[PDB]
Amino acid sequence: LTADQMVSALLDAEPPILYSEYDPTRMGLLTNLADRELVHMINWAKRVPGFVDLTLHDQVHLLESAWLEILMIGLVWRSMEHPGKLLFAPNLLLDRNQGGMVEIFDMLLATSSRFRMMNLQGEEFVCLKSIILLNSGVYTFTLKSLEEKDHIHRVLDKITDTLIHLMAKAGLTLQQQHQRLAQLLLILSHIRHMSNKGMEHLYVPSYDLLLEMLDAHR
Amino acid sequence: LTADQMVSALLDAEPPILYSEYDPTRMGLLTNLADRELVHMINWAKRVPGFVDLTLHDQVHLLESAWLEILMIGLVWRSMEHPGKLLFAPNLLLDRNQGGMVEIFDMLLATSSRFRMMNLQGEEFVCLKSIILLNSGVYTFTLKSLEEKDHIHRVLDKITDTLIHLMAKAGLTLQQQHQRLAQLLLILSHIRHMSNKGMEHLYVPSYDLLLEMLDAHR
Ligand SMILES: CCN1CC[C@@H](COc2ccc([C@@H]3c4ccc(O)cc4CC4(CC4)N3C(=O)c3ccccc3)cc2)C1
Ligand SMILES: CCN1CC[C@@H](COc2ccc([C@@H]3c4ccc(O)cc4CC4(CC4)N3C(=O)c3ccccc3)cc2)C1
């Protein structure tokens, strides 16, 4: 694919924005939301170029390592234009007072604010989210396994090329392109941090459930 | 500073390689080693360009967030040329059988192997380690605080420029430069992951101890 075809494919693959299911006229809400998003996550992952080329075992491993980071970056992206609040759903917009939960809440807000300051574009966001899917499990995986890693690194490389294409397209200098690429990728370290803190706070989709959702028939 | 002056400064700032203190003729060893390295860590941090320009409070916060990542990347760097082992010290080279410890052990080995495959250069390593110091605490911090963040981001940007300079210097194409920059920075997400897993396994230098070591007289 060209760089522009990568962007188009990623933008069309975007999952829908789900609603919280509480009676409008009247933690479980957050858990219920995450349950429903996971199914659409699977469908999104299978449309990330190169992902379905992996073994089903490798797909499960990547989704198992990445799922909370992917939910968290989606949240931070939705919340960008809502200073001081997290848009868990269009009908569930909470501030820090409504949130060990407030510690994680404050980190998500700070990431949303950093996105705001950098003026993160939707095209960049979908590249970052695909990078999370491919990268988060790649250091925790046979000849076929060596081939699986090479492929993942080639796909990651093409997303890097795509991010740079977007920035050159927008008129950034070569220096500004590298600098913004680095700033975006360092935010992924903070998203990993939050995911780890969140996985600590949650003590989770099982391998078998993920495999059951990924191991589709035709 | 020029890019080449950044590299020289960072290389000279490198801390010494400490030895384990056990009687050669005959977890505490790992803890003792980390205690001694922390003091040299402080001295190293104060020589990272731009770090001492921060408030003492901001320096402490950054070191508090980064210290285990910095110890871990140093370990992975030392261990690169020792497949299957971790060189905690020149006299303490352990394999995974000698190591919830083995889970973290295996992640460090995998990072060392990834460094090996990419042929990480010492000049790149010192850039990455400085990036960890400046980035790991920056999303968890007043007008002076806004000025502190701008400065940190400017220093981070200059290290990005330096990494690219090193890669262009080595003859990489512009495409290969961006791709390698991205590959290096994504490894920092895995180092953060390991640090979080390690901080979980350790349940640590206090704020006051760090401040006491950083709040030097003349
Ligand atoms: C029944 C089985 N399932 C499969 C395993 C399990 C699901 O685990 C969950 C539960 C809740 C969440 C929500 C949630 C929801 C939607 C969203 O888009 C993002 C998030 C983000 C997020 C901080 C991470 N969160 C929290 O509640 C939170 C906590 C403390 C501070 C702030 C926020 C995420 C995952 C239940
Ligand atoms: C007395 C007060 N101090 C201040 C707080 C506290 C210090 O905490 C420590 C203790 C130990 C370590 C060592 C250590 C040492 C040197 C090195 O260069 C790197 C590391 C890396 C590392 C995995 C992270 N580690 C482990 O033991 C390990 C565990 C499980 C699997 C593999 C390795 C790091 C930090 C004690």
Residue numbers in the entry:
A (entry chain A), B (entry chain A): 310 to 335, 343 to 415, 420 to 461, 465 to 526, 534 to 548
The article reads:
Estrogen receptor alpha (ERα) is a ligand-dependent master transcriptional regulator and key driver of breast cancer pathology. Rather, H12 packs into the AF-2 cleft via an LXXML motif to sterically preclude transcriptional coregulator binding.
We solved x-ray co-crystal structures to reveal how the T6Is bound in the ERα hormone binding pocket and to understand the structural basis of differential efficacy. In these structures, the T6Is are well ordered in the ligand binding pocket and form canonical ERα LBD antagonist conformations with H12 packed in the AF-2 cleft. Hydrogen bonds are formed between the T6I core, E353, R394, and a water molecule while the side arm forms a hydrogen bond with D351 to favor an antagonistic H12 conformation that is docked into the AF2-cleft. The T6I core is superimposable between the 10 structures but the side arms adopt divergent vectors near H12 that correlate with ligand-specific antagonistic differences. It should be noted that we previously reduced alkyl length to an ethyl with T6I-13-1 and observed reduced efficacy compared to the propyl of T6I-14-1.
